[PDB]
Design a protein around this ligand. Sequence first.
Ligand SMILES: [Mg+2]
Ligand SMILES: [Mg+2]
Ligand SMILES: [Mg+2]
Ligand SMILES: [Mg+2]
Ligand SMILES: [Mg+2]
Ligand SMILES: [Mg+2]
Ligand SMILES: [Mg+2]
Ligand SMILES: [Mg+2]
Ligand SMILES: [Mg+2]
Ligand SMILES: [Mg+2]
Ligand SMILES: [Mg+2]
Ligand SMILES: [Mg+2]
Ligand SMILES: [Mg+2]
Ligand SMILES: [Mg+2]
Ligand SMILES: [Mg+2]
Ligand SMILES: [Mg+2]
Ligand SMILES: [Mg+2]
Ligand SMILES: [Mg+2]
Ligand SMILES: [Mg+2]
Ligand SMILES: [Mg+2]
Ligand SMILES: [Mg+2]
Ligand SMILES: [Mg+2]
Ligand SMILES: [Mg+2]
Ligand SMILES: [Mg+2]
Ligand SMILES: [Mg+2]
Ligand SMILES: [Mg+2]
Ligand SMILES: [Mg+2]
Ligand SMILES: [Mg+2]
Ligand SMILES: [Mg+2]
Ligand SMILES: [Mg+2]
Ligand SMILES: [Mg+2]
Ligand SMILES: [Mg+2]
Ligand SMILES: [Mg+2]
Ligand SMILES: [Mg+2]
Ligand SMILES: [Mg+2]
Ligand SMILES: [Mg+2]
Ligand SMILES: [Mg+2]
Ligand SMILES: [Mg+2]
Ligand SMILES: [Mg+2]
Ligand SMILES: [Mg+2]
Ligand SMILES: [Mg+2]
Ligand SMILES: [Mg+2]
Ligand SMILES: [Mg+2]
Ligand SMILES: [Mg+2]
Ligand SMILES: [Mg+2]
Ligand SMILES: [Mg+2]
Ligand SMILES: [Mg+2]
Ligand SMILES: [Mg+2]
Ligand SMILES: [Mg+2]
Ligand SMILES: [Mg+2]
Ligand SMILES: [Mg+2]
Ligand SMILES: [Mg+2]
Ligand SMILES: [Mg+2]
Ligand SMILES: [Mg+2]
Ligand SMILES: [Mg+2]
Ligand SMILES: [Mg+2]
Ligand SMILES: [Mg+2]
Ligand SMILES: [Mg+2]
Ligand SMILES: [Mg+2]
Ligand SMILES: [Mg+2]
Ligand SMILES: [Mg+2]
Ligand SMILES: [Mg+2]
Ligand SMILES: [Mg+2]
Ligand SMILES: [Mg+2]
Ligand SMILES: [Mg+2]
Ligand SMILES: [Zn+2]
Lengths: 134, 122, 50, 52, 86, 59, 135
Amino acid sequence: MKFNPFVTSDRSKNRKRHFNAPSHIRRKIMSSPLSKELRQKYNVRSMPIRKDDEVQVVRGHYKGQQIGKVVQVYRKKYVIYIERVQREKANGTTVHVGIHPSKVVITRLKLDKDRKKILERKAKSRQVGKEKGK
Amino acid sequence: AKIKARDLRGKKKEELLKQLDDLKVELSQLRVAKVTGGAASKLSKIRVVRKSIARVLTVINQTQKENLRKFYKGKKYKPLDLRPKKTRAMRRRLNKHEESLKTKKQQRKERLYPLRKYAVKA
Amino acid sequence: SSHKTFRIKRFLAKKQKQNRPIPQWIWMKTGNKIRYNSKRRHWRRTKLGL
Amino acid sequence: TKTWRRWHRRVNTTQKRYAICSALAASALPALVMSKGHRIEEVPELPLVVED
Amino acid sequence: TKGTSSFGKRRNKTHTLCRRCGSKAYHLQKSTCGKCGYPAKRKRKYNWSAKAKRRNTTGTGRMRHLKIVYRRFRHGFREGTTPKPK
Amino acid sequence: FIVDVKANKHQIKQAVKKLYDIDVAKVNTLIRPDGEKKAYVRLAPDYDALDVANKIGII
Amino acid sequence: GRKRPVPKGATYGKPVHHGVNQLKFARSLQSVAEERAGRHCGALRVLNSYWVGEDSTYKFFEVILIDPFHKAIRRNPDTQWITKPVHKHREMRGLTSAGRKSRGLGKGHKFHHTIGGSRRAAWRRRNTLQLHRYR
RNA sequence: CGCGACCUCAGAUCAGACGUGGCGACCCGCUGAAUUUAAGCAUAUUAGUCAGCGGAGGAAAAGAAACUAACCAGGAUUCCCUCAGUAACGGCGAGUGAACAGGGAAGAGCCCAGCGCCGAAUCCCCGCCCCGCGGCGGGGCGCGGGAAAUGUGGCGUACGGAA
RNA sequence: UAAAUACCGGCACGAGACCGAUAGUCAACAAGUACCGUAAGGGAAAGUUGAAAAGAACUUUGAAGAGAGAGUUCAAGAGGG
RNA sequence: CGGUCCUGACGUGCGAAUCGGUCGUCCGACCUGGGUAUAGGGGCGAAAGACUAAUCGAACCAUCUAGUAGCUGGUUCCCUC
RNA sequence: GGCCGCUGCGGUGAGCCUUGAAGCCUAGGGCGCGGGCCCGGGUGGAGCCGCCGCAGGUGCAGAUCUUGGUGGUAGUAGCAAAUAUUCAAACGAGAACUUUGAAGGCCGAAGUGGAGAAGGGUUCCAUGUGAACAGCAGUUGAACAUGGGUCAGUCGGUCCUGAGAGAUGGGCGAGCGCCGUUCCGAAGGGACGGGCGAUGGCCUCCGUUGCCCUCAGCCGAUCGAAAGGGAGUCGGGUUCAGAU
RNA sequence: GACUCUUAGCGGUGGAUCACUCGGCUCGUGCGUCGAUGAAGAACGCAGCUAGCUGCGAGAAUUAAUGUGAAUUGCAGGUUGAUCAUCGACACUUCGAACGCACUUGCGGCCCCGGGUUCCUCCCGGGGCUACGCCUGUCUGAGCGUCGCU
Ligand SMILES: [Mg+2]
Ligand SMILES: [Mg+2]
Ligand SMILES: [Mg+2]
Ligand SMILES: [Mg+2]
Ligand SMILES: [Mg+2]
Ligand SMILES: [Mg+2]
Ligand SMILES: [Mg+2]
Ligand SMILES: [Mg+2]
Ligand SMILES: [Mg+2]
Ligand SMILES: [Mg+2]
Ligand SMILES: [Mg+2]
Ligand SMILES: [Mg+2]
Ligand SMILES: [Mg+2]
Ligand SMILES: [Mg+2]
Ligand SMILES: [Mg+2]
Ligand SMILES: [Mg+2]
Ligand SMILES: [Mg+2]
Ligand SMILES: [Mg+2]
Ligand SMILES: [Mg+2]
Ligand SMILES: [Mg+2]
Ligand SMILES: [Mg+2]
Ligand SMILES: [Mg+2]
Ligand SMILES: [Mg+2]
Ligand SMILES: [Mg+2]
Ligand SMILES: [Mg+2]
Ligand SMILES: [Mg+2]
Ligand SMILES: [Mg+2]
Ligand SMILES: [Mg+2]
Ligand SMILES: [Mg+2]
Ligand SMILES: [Mg+2]
Ligand SMILES: [Mg+2]
Ligand SMILES: [Mg+2]
Ligand SMILES: [Mg+2]
Ligand SMILES: [Mg+2]
Ligand SMILES: [Mg+2]
Ligand SMILES: [Mg+2]
Ligand SMILES: [Mg+2]
Ligand SMILES: [Mg+2]
Ligand SMILES: [Mg+2]
Ligand SMILES: [Mg+2]
Ligand SMILES: [Mg+2]
Ligand SMILES: [Mg+2]
Ligand SMILES: [Mg+2]
Ligand SMILES: [Mg+2]
Ligand SMILES: [Mg+2]
Ligand SMILES: [Mg+2]
Ligand SMILES: [Mg+2]
Ligand SMILES: [Mg+2]
Ligand SMILES: [Mg+2]
Ligand SMILES: [Mg+2]
Ligand SMILES: [Mg+2]
Ligand SMILES: [Mg+2]
Ligand SMILES: [Mg+2]
Ligand SMILES: [Mg+2]
Ligand SMILES: [Mg+2]
Ligand SMILES: [Mg+2]
Ligand SMILES: [Mg+2]
Ligand SMILES: [Mg+2]
Ligand SMILES: [Mg+2]
Ligand SMILES: [Mg+2]
Ligand SMILES: [Mg+2]
Ligand SMILES: [Mg+2]
Ligand SMILES: [Mg+2]
Ligand SMILES: [Mg+2]
Ligand SMILES: [Mg+2]
Ligand SMILES: [Zn+2]
């Protein structure tokens, strides 16, 4: 149950906020879970998706075990494009099929200084939380 | 290359002006190319040149106004631009010193009868 | 009339500028509901006031 | 509709306490509890009391 | 000649656009605005027309200064200071 | 040329002289029905309008 | 006195409201004087006024005004109360002595129709249906 | 005749400030109807209400008795319950209509003029120097300039005060 | 001269035994908009493809709108009001 | 410039006052554009209660107002007594 | 009296539901005196219901009811004011209407001609199209879409005042404000010239100057005419659309 | 056989019902802030392709700074920080209480600069001023107003 008297349970308000969130909030919404091995080796459960990460598709018509590289993150439509998840149009052109990041599992992150800083921050937060809990 | 603003603070007004004039000439050439029919590359560079103009002008203005504030810092009368622009009511309100100064009679009253700290047994 | 004032000429210029159909490349946006310009104005039919 | 419709009601304290007593008395009968629908079949004793 | 025939003699106007409110209600011979009373210092506003009151009030325009005023009040009208440089 | 509505013939002549380093004989101006102010700038007889257009970039 | 500004003495209504001649103004002539003095002197603030003369057709008063932004007034702790914005145009709202005289306010059983802030306040308190949640 | 004071009154693009207009849910001051009810209608009612005008604030107004009471007396203002649809008003018809005491929310008191006594002991402004400076203030120096005796400041205000 | 007091405007909020596109604000949408009146002013109608445009390549009759085949889709018995 | 008669045409018209023939006046109390003044119990009227934006024996717009009506119209499922 | 019906809330049905909810159609099977209800078939694609209580903006055939849609009339009334068309060719998928040539006609210089004022505001010009509009049709358009086009010392506004409107002073007014236009105003910021003091130019002589001396009426600020008053441009050529 | 009626199947016209809801309505809470340093409101302009809506102001779908940290997207285009959010520096067209006089965007005056002149006057461009009322102080004044000296 929610006890904070300054956040809503209003369905309409939550939908409006989600569909009108600015880009830097779209980034936070567009988060995907790391694989089992990455999760074990980083102590971090999820990471906002980036443009050049290897991922897998877990649900839908394109689910499988193949490793695909993200092509572009289309924040306006809340979908991401992978390098070989695509269908065939009528004329013969191949266009990409959008997939929600919540149905995708990250396989190998694109590391830079800021990404590493995010990972270490999340790891430290989970460590302090576990110390408090136990 | 990419004209930024960090590398312009340390410069001097004359080369700032000459860079601005060169940028304006480039923008004029781009607009001529646009009206005659040119390349989408130049059409896209038009906005880049416009933003470069904007940032050069704002750096010039900021440096000039900070220098002028330093000039008028010690003076008692200064331009309305350099006066603080709060709301009208907050400009008309009594200032901090004179809304706190008090009469000798009631200050003597306060010093003779200070409000004490006391407790009452249950 | 041929005898105009600067203000009335400028107003007519603006109305003429805004009397225009929509470009088709807006029709392909994501959240677009516009299908045509519903604020058109034909000189014979609507007389613009004034 | 108006905002000054009589929304709230008033009940005497004596009969409010009467109702509380009646509810507590009914909550100690296995027939009444099972009729209300609780799965109390394996419960050892219906006035279930546990230590502090 | 009471109707159709007499409608043809209407060729010169009685109202033009006024400088203050931009509505075609500036009487030319009177030199007064029918909607806002432009020559008068005070805005023309009446309590028997709520629709007219709400058609052009503070909520209808651009709010150029007053929205910035609200934004600055949210922080208390700070001046002279800048955020801590990196 | 197309100039802004606040320009007069003296300013237009001086601006053309400054920007293009040419001599100006006379200036005709009108305001188009669109709102922009067109300018007809005639040059001194010893300059060549074809050459000026070539250098400015219109042809 | 004050006569009713009605065209040609034609009050379209009931006979009770037909009079236009023998009517009187609610406020006093001293209050009217202070009002127009302050109205002309917009930047100044009116304190009080007194009586200096009268003839058949005129009365004369002297209104005491204070400039609120003079520092000799701003820096005095016993008379800087007049600089507060709440005292802006006292004579317009009937806060000066002459304005208060015609408001019928004061202690006692004679001023029962003013108990509260003012006459309007008393009327509003009395003419309101208090509807409690439980009544 | 001229010169010098004071008094009343002028002109300044004189130095420095201030007001104007907007919104108007709530508030203060004026002005103020008629539909309607009375089974007609004129007093009355609608109603000090709508319309109209002016003036503010974050609240406004009120406010520390020229009070209530007739008791073994209470003790500024404002708000809630009750007093009470009561006393009273009313072609005594229709209708209208408080306050005191009691219980609570809050709770805070003060200042002048005047009579007096203190060498005007009082205040504003311009200049330099030192500091502070986005609420223009503190200190030192001017045989610097004004306001003020047609009355500034200190003590002092009905609970008494002064020596 | 603060407090207890008032608040259908304004800046943020939270909730509801409320209405659910002829309802609820006139206005769920480019609504005080289109439009009407010389003017004061008056003032609407108008939501929904699909999970994803995958929005029908190509063949053919016709000048063309428009059809017959082929194809997408789970469904065109969802073909751009 | 006006509008007699045919009481003609039309009379869901070409037209919310038009058409045809026939008619009155045509140097004057003449016809007319633009500017200007007079505003609603008011204007203006060679006077018909005429005209005052298709509205005049008291214009138009918003509000008081959801004005009152002893008077017309309507008033939503079943069975049983 | 309703185990008649509608919407929402509190409890209850280990209720129903993508192996298919609501809704809709049904020559299907039934129940109830009735209000109505339950099954079967089809369509549809995401929610719904029974019992115990609670609440209500809770049940339509009518109101010259409101909004929206659709009929008969009806392929009907009508597309009849102002004399009138014809032959051939071209483009074109397609010609009674477009264009060109020829013929026959009308307006008849108070015009069905050539140009302006008010008003309209891009309708003006070229190309392209023929979805919609032009009450038949269109190869056409004042339609639609792309693009172009209005050049001034000597045309006019700009200036003046007219009938009139309108500030300051003043008066009145609770007040927004109103009256008033020379009337209860210290209503001139100008100058022939002389002197005084400062300045630049070969400080010659003059100019820019601050003061004194001297001289001095405005009918009242200001607005008010694209037909009134008001100096000054004509000839030839030029575009697709502009020419003093 | 035509036409007419009823019924059912299918297909039309039409948008009822059902289900949805970035919208309202009501209640409650905190704050409770405009303007001559130019407000509310109006007009006109600004995007590579842009009409409306939105944002903005000749620096014109924004500059600077802070935070976040790899995008925007309908089509093109070219990590020492793209985009968003915040917003404290800068900037902010013409009207509008609206301010030189009028409201055509017409006509001025004073001062200082750069063209001209080589200040000698014109003329051009730019910048700063030029409203009403009122308070304090300053300067210049007025009066057969009350005086004093000569
Ligand atoms: Mg929390
Ligand atoms: Mg004292
Ligand atoms: Mg027309
Ligand atoms: Mg007129
Ligand atoms: Mg007002
Ligand atoms: Mg009366
Ligand atoms: Mg009264
Ligand atoms: Mg008080
Ligand atoms: Mg008295
Ligand atoms: Mg000054
Ligand atoms: Mg005000
Ligand atoms: Mg009656
Ligand atoms: Mg009756
Ligand atoms: Mg009657
Ligand atoms: Mg009466
Ligand atoms: Mg009364
Ligand atoms: Mg009122
Ligand atoms: Mg305020
Ligand atoms: Mg107060
Ligand atoms: Mg006392
Ligand atoms: Mg009783
Ligand atoms: Mg009464
Ligand atoms: Mg009491
Ligand atoms: Mg207490
Ligand atoms: Mg004293
Ligand atoms: Mg709650
Ligand atoms: Mg609908
Ligand atoms: Mg609706
Ligand atoms: Mg519906
Ligand atoms: Mg419905
Ligand atoms: Mg639909
Ligand atoms: Mg949907
Ligand atoms: Mg289906
Ligand atoms: Mg379907
Ligand atoms: Mg007749
Ligand atoms: Mg007839
Ligand atoms: Mg007939
Ligand atoms: Mg009259
Ligand atoms: Mg006559
Ligand atoms: Mg008669
Ligand atoms: Mg009338
Ligand atoms: Mg009625
Ligand atoms: Mg009867
Ligand atoms: Mg669905
Ligand atoms: Mg309901
Ligand atoms: Mg019906
Ligand atoms: Mg026929
Ligand atoms: Mg015909
Ligand atoms: Mg003939
Ligand atoms: Mg012609
Ligand atoms: Mg002609
Ligand atoms: Mg043409
Ligand atoms: Mg046709
Ligand atoms: Mg010439
Ligand atoms: Mg003039
Ligand atoms: Mg006047
Ligand atoms: Mg003229
Ligand atoms: Mg003329
Ligand atoms: Mg059937
Ligand atoms: Mg529909
Ligand atoms: Mg539909
Ligand atoms: Mg644009
Ligand atoms: Mg930036
Ligand atoms: Mg950054
Ligand atoms: Mg004029
Ligand atoms: Zn106006």
